[PDB]
Amino acid sequence: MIRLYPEQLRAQLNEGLRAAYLLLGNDPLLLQESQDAVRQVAAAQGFEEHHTFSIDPNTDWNAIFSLCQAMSLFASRQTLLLLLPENGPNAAINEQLLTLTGLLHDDLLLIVRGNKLSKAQENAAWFTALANRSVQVTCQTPEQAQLPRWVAARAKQLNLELDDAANQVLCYCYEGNLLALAQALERLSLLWPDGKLTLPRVEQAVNDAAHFTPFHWVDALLMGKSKRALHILQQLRLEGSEPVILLRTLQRELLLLVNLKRQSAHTPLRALFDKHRVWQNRRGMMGEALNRLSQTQLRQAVQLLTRTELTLKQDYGQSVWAELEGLSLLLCHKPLADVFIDG
Template identity: 90%
Template structure:
């Protein structure tokens, strides 16, 4: 299995088409652009028919199999796009995919689209069969740390000269929303034909369209980044996120931190991470938060969170965004007015 990022795909396509391409990830722009690039390369090599199926319980697998086996002297080469379910294929679907993977031939190019697969799903027979002659493209939305590099590469590909400050502003305004970011770069290229994108020029044309989840907010709190946490909170509020979901997400993290804080006095942190099944890519961040946050802060945060939940239960329509901002500042090690903590 060849594993690539979308920006590496075009170079691979120039080397020659593989039998199958697995486009896996959560980013609509990266998924669509990768599919378009593959279809364009395939069309140039005589793949004139393009078919697409969304896999679900009502999928007509016999029609799919017939399509794969339709070979004649006059049949044109064809591409077949299969959209996996949101949670990946189930056991029954895995069996059908295993059958289909054995029907591939030189005049049929398979493109599978879906979310990132779990390790268990990658052990399915259809996946292992395709692995020998396929390319997997990771279409995950870049995280905050990787986004500036992605933006710089995108700008360079469009012959745009983007300075660092302008890059930072674009990342701030469009994190988690690559489609809007790509559209912003297109708009800027039209506004400034000389291609020189300085901070003042970019400021005139951007709007805050970043997209976040509650997990981004919690991660910002763990890292003690108050400005980022408040920015995320503002965007979540504008998108109509439910405060109760934010509270529940933070509650799980606070309980984990308190347990780790208490148990780490007599048990190595690595052992505790294994016990509580903390993901490897979160361990350094949680370890830093444990060193930074005092037990008193954690207790105060739990008190404020509990009181906020009670407020919501008593009057679901009451706004608690001020309390969520207070929680953000408290966990980012900022001084809080007593009214937030003591009620």
């Protein structure tokens, strides 16, 4: 199994088509781009007839197997496409994929599109049977730090000049939404075909259609970026995510921070992080937070968190969205008034 990124696919595709291609990632844009490149190269190499299927307990599997085992009157080369569910390949789906690999043939090219593969998913034997001769493509969304480099690289690929300001604006407005980022890049390239993009040109045709996760909010709170935390919170509210998800995601980390701040009086943070399986980036963020947070701030944060939880669960109130800004402004560097933490 050759594991690759969408940057390196072209050369591999020029090396020669592989029996199976597994497009796996959480990013729609990179998955679609890799799929388009694979299909274009296959069409160049004779693969003319394309078939698409969706994996589902409602999938007519017999039709898929017959198509994989039936020759066509025209364009004998065939491409099979599958769309993995959000849960990935289930055990029954794993057996179905094993049977499909058993019927894999030279004249048939197989493409798989779906979310990331969890360890158990590739543990299943069909994955290894494919990996004996296949290529896997990890289309994972670049993190916050890696976004400007990718945006600049794509801009240079698309033959348009981007400065630091426009790149920063695009990164701030389209994070986790690379599809909309490429839509905006096309929009700006077509709006002004001069190829030079600066702050005044890009500040017009860019909206804040970002896509975030609760982990982004928690990491923003940990790093102390109050403005970024508020941006993530507002974006998540506009998206419609359940506030209880945010409450739990913050609660786990906040309880860990409280315990580690309590324990820091006897043991340095280096051993404390290793005690409870804290990862390296998480180790750095947590160390920064524990150094920039006292006991009183953590206690007030927990008090506000439990007040918000009580408001949400027993009163069924709609003030949790506004109250979460209280935590956002309390954790970073700013103590809040007593009445807004208890009452």
